[PDB]
Amino acid sequence: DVSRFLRLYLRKEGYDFHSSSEFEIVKAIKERACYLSINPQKDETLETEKAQYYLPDGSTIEIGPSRFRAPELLFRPDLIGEESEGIHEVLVFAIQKSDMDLRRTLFSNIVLSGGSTLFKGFGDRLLSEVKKLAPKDVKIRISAPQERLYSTWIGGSILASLDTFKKMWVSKKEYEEDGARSIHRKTF
Amino acid sequence: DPKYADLPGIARNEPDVYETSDLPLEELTSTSVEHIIVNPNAAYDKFKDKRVGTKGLDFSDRIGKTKRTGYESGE
Ligand SMILES: Nc1ncnc2c1ncn2[C@@H]1O[C@H](COP(=O)(O)OP(=O)(O)O)[C@@H](O)[C@H]1O
């Protein structure tokens, strides 16, 4: 959705990327030229860098303020016209939906993963957002490793390199005997 | 007129003009659409007294408030 919203912005910037290969070029732009805001109004009232990205064809594209307006969709889905929550609201609600004795420890241990957290200047805005939402003086501590893109894979390798994994999967025979109910029982 | 006598090759009995005999929509009547007759007087009378309040509006890609809905007031 960040890439799709950026594609719409480039249509309004006069570039009309609408093909499929053009869409993956937009993905390359999103991964390379966008960056997150700190205060979108402080940066909205002032003009920016206007990065010059070069297409594989050799063309030249300029992005302007949309380089920070594109990944704003995560923290605010109102831009795309969708009543939902921000990513900060998801994190804060997910904490507050739990118990009370655990809220402080969950605030002190926030682990990111997923490729769409690699935006430059992301976690700092996440701290300002959650700090703006979380209670007073609670220590919010976000750990963001370098291998965020492969955390789910590395962890899959860790759990699959155990004997508990042998005591944890689903037997082929048992699947043939049961079917869907087998996996829905052993889903956790 | 006097170019006949003074010049040798200017002949007469010449038909100056050689000529020939000068010989001498259905898409709006479809059953699919509902053809509507546009009347600017009726539409003008309909939207005659409907104001539009443009007090502090925006349409650009400015993200400061939550949402952005221009044209707030009326009458
Ligand atoms: N350097 C980057 N900056 C911004 N976004 C990135 C970057 N690298 C990857 N991404 C985003 O991460 C996505 C990769 O998705 P990914 O997180 O791998 O899904 P999954 O983690 O479920 O495999 C890419 O589509 C891209 O939009």
Q: Quick check: A44 and B66 CB within 8 A? A: no
Nearest CA in chain B to A79: B67
**Residues 6+ away with beta carbon under 8 Å from A57:** none
CA distance A95 to A110: 10
Structure-solving method: cryo-EM
| A9 neighbors A70 (Cβ within 8 angstroms) | yes
Question: Which one of A9, A44, A66 has the shortest CB-CB distance to B62?
Answer: A44
Superfamily of domain A1-84: ATPase, substrate binding domain, subdomain 4 (3.90.640.10)
Residue A60 has what DSSP assignment? E
Least Cα distance to A2 among A144, A118, A134, A89 occurs for A118
Q: Is A69 on the interface with B (CB under 8 A)?
A: yes
Name residue, tokens 């699919």: B32
Q: What is the 3-state secondary structure (H, E, C) of A86-122?
A: CHHHHHHHHHHCCCCCCHHHHHCCEECCCHHHCCECC
CA distance A4 to A27: 9
Q: Is B61 on the interface with A (CB under 8 A)?
A: yes
Beta-bridge partners for A110: A142
Six-digit token string for A164: 């508990």
- Cβ of A114 below 6 Å from ligand 1: yes
The counts of H helices and E strands in chain B are 1, 0
DSSP B7-43: -SS--SS--S----------SS--SSS------HHHH
CA distance B54 to B74: 9
CA distance A155 to A173: 27
Least Cα distance to A117 among A77, A149, A89, A158 occurs for A149
Helix (H) or strand (E) holding A54: strand A52-54
Q: Report the gap between the CA of A53 and the closest CA in chain B (Å).
A: 21
Q: What are phi and psi of A88, to 5 degrees?
A: -70, -40
**Which residues on B lie below 8 Å from A44 (Cβ)?**
62-64
Least Cα distance to A61 among A16, A1, A20, A117 occurs for A16
**In Å, how far are A119, A166, A174, A176, B33 from A183, measured between CA atoms?**
36, 15, 10, 11, 53
Handedness of CA B44, B46, B50, B52 (dihedral sign): negative
DSSP A10-52: HHHTT----SHHHHHHHHHHHHHT-B--SSTTTTTSS-----E
**In Å, how far are A103, A107, A129, A169, B63 from A98, measured between CA atoms?**
7, 12, 20, 28, 32
Beta-bridge partners for A60: A54
Domain A85-151 coded CATH 3.30.420.40: yes
Q: Quick check: B61 and A40 CB within 8 A? A: no
Name residue, tokens 């939902």: A84
